[PDB]
A paper describes a structure:
Type I-D CRISPR–Cas systems, which are found both in bacteria and archaea, are exceptional in that they contain a hybrid large subunit, Cas10d, bearing resemblance to both the signature proteins found in type I (Cas3) and type III (Cas10). As predicted from comparative sequence analysis, the 847 residue (94 kDa) S. islandicus Cas10d consists of six domains: A HD nuclease domain (1–186), a Cyclase/RRM domain (187–425), a zinc finger domain (426–490), a Palm/RRM domain (491–623), and a C-terminal helical region consisting of a polymerase-like Thumb domain (624–719) and an extension with predicted homology to Cas11 (720–847).
The isolated protein does not readily crystallise likely due to intrinsic flexibility, however, we were able to obtain crystals of a mildly trypsin-treated sample and determine the structure at 4.0 Å using molecular replacement. The new crystals contain two copies of Cas10d in the crystallographic asymmetric unit, for which the flexible N terminus (residues 1–13) that interacts with AcrID1, appears to have been cleaved off. Moreover, the Palm/RRM domain has been nicked by the protease resulting in the protein appearing as two bands on a denaturing polyacrylamide gel. The helical insertion in the Palm/RRM domain, which interacts directly with AcrID1 in the complex structure, has shifted away from the core of the protein by about 5 Å in comparison to the complex with AcrID1. Consequently, it is likely that this domain gets organised when Cas10d joins the backbone complex and forms the complete I-D effector complex. In summary, we conclude that the extended structure of Cas10d is an intrinsic feature and not an effect of AcrID1 binding.
Numbering used by the authors: 14 to 103, 107 to 437, 477 to 611, 613 to 847
The structure:
Amino acid sequence: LIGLVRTALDSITLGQGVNEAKIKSPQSYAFHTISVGTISLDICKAIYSSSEIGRKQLENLSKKYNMPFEDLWFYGGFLHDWNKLSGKEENKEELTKKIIDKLKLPNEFLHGISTMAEGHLPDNLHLPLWVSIKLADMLLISDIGSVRDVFYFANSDSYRNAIEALKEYNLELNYVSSTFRLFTLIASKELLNDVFNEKSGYFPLISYADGIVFLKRKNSQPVLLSKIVDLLSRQVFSSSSEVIEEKISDIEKCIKNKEELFRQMNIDVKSAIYDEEGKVKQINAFLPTKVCKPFEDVVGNLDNKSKLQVAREVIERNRKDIPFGLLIYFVNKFSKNEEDYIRKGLGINEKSLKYLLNIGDVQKALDKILELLEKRYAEQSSDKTLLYYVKFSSSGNIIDDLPKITDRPNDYCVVCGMPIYVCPICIYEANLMKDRVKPPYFIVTFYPGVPISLLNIIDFDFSQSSIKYYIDEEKDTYFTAFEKMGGRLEPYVKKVLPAYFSSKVIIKASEVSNFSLSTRLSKSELNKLLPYAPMISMIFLTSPVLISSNLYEMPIHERVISITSTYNYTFMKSLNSNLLTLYSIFAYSAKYDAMRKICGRSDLDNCLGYLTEEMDLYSSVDPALGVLSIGMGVGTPIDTDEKFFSAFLPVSGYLLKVTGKVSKMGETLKSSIFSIAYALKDIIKSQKVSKYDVTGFLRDGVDMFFKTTSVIKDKEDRIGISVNAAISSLENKYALDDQHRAQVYSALQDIFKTLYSIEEESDRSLAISIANTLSNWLYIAYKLVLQGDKS
Ligand SMILES: [Zn+2]
């Protein structure tokens, strides 16, 4: 059921799927391919159920290839998309032969899939597959953009023939427009299970933010707005068991304390209601306001799943108890404002009890129930109904609601813009924003849309996994790397909250980090939240992510993915490739870990703030500088031993690995440092190396480069003396093989050449910091060649 997905991701190499598909949209190879297959599988499920002819047809189709029914359908679309996307300028379609080897699939199927892609019907048996895939292919157009565009592109294009065949499979197409809101997200799953069930016969497919697209079997019960409206009345009502639990003790306390007299007047109501001391007792003598809160004051602002349940499951909760004692309460403490006994009241303030009948009379009060309370059940309904007239409109559904006349309603909501009779919509959302959905949040949009059948599958667990960033482009495959990313697949997902009708998903930050969050999103806290972000993107098949404290923050469309925020930093800029983009943030992911170990708990806030600005500044010139941004300027302990040797040492290799592919400038820089780092251990065989014992000559040449006197020299004239000073100090300190010294010379030349190029751009003042950066980075590279498998 979900295992097909596992196999596919296991076969495609990490970088294979991370790659950008089309220049038109920010789509990942994996995102699109897996998605096409997902829909493909769901489609065949519908056919098997509805068409009995197609059911047997699909059955024989499986036997032809000796492939399990379900599995045969999925990989069909997945590969079809890949072979279609082989239109990338390379066309090296030989890549599929590797996939075929890991998939262990027959060539005949592929030969058919080739004619499914380019060609036409393999044969009439292969028709449902030809149809299913074509449908899914159309649904994931570069930018379908709108649900209506789907229908326009349907019929207009070759996809029309498939719709013609769909009708013959006793299956029709439909859609419902739905606007994104906080309330929609929570009950989204419930609706899918209740309204769009295979029981009624709906099989939901994908959503595009404008709404949802689904299927309708012939003679299926039509989509009815009645239940749509009936459901929220119960859901917009946060009637949890614990919501009802308080009043259980509230009014219990008011009455349980008088158990003495709440049983005695079962006989001789007069012996208790009357006293020899006078005539009668005060309500407060029998029910003190001290321990008793008035009924309507007890039920402050509740309606039915709370107040009618408070008039049912709370009138009869322990009312099996002192059914006799409970009576006096409603007979007397009917609370302030409404002393409306509205019953067989005799008007006697006290002797009424003797005149009335026995406990058979209780049932009559139970008849007065389901009256004023259920009024609130059908009261603010039309306030909400306006959404089902405007927001939840444009649908193949049927409106089952009254007209919106409600002659003279009350004012329209100040914020949600909805009339009443603010609004409860924002009120419910505000109670929710207290804890159920506390800010800030992580929102990931999907282009054009995302299969609902996959939206209920993905989850994640970063509790034990902590932060993990060790991946390779071609070594580890997508799945193995996804496993390291701590991603999970639960049909009953618990830590992911998807707005199924908005082609987007939100993740509450509370489950992601145990860190203390804030009321909003701040630049300081933004830093701490960033390392987890790229992982989320990768877990969601390389999809763009935005971090924000307001859900309705609409995200900002290059062919590449974009990790963005309320405010955008330069280092967060999207590079020419998704592979590179992720690696750039994976660099921060690694730096964060080290900083955590280095700075103290409180010191981290100020530490990270500085790292952020520095990384931003360096990346402005070249992204490669961004990758190496550790600091080496002003603001951090220059305690190299308490810094590099402490935690930066292991990830160094990975960081340098990234610096290798970010830019050609960085390619030259990385190679140069590494060449020198290899040469270093040759000369200084001994590991009695000190800080200055290895970098002195370098700094000597650097100071010389920057010495104002040498600056007036031409680019080549200056780099001449600069390197000449460096290598002079080297041979002053240690003799150099005339053979070996040449390697370093050539490398240093490019180093000083780029130094002139980072001086051509930007300012020489800033360039100095980058020199110090690379300086300490050279010692690091020397420690890395000295690593030699050191745990
Ligand atoms: Zn409102």
